[PDB]
C-alpha cells in the first residue's frame, strides 16, 4: 500500500524481463529429471545468480492502492477498491447477481 513497498516489488518485476526472458531456458534443461541416468550437478550447484530474482517472489498488488492480499487475476485490484469500482459504473459486465 506504501510507495516504498510497491517499488520494492517493481524492482522484482524489472529483472523478470532480463534474467527470466532468455537465460531461464539455459537452466531449465538440467534442473528437471532427465530420462537418462546422467544428470549434471554443475549447473544446479553454480545456481547462485537468482538471489533477488525469482518468479515466485512476484505479488500482483492493487493497481490503485497496492496491498498484497485478495488479488483477483481477472481484475488486478483488491476486494475493497474492486468493489468501489463496480458499485459505481467503472467496469463493463459487473452487475448485481442472484445465484
Amino acid at each position: 500500500a506504501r510507495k516504498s513497498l510497491i517499488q520494492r516489488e517493481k524492482k522484482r518485476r524489472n529483472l523478470e524481463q532480463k534474467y527470466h526472458l532468455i537465460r531461464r531456458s539455459s537452466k531449465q534443461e538440467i534442473r528437471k529429471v532427465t530420462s537418462l541416468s546422467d544428470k549434471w550437478e554443475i549447473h544446479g550447484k553454480l545456481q547462485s545468480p537468482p538471489r533477488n530474482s525469482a518468479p515466485a517472489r512476484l505479488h500482483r498488488r492493487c493497481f490503485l492502492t497496492g496491498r498484497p492480499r485478495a488479488n483477483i487475476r481477472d481484475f488486478g485490484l483488491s476486494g475493497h477498491i474492486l468493489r468501489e469500482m463496480v458499485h459505481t459504473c467503472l467496469l463493463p459486465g459487473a452487475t448485481r447477481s442472484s445465484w
Binding site: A70, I72, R83
Partner: peptide
C-alpha cells in the same frame, strides 16, 4: 468478496459477469 475492510466475515456480496 468481503465488504468491510476488517473483521466482518458476513455480508459478503456477489459479482456477475
Amino acid at each position: 468478496v468481503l465488504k468491510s475492510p476488517h473483521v466482518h466475515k458476513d455480508a459478503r456480496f456477489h459479482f456477475e459477469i
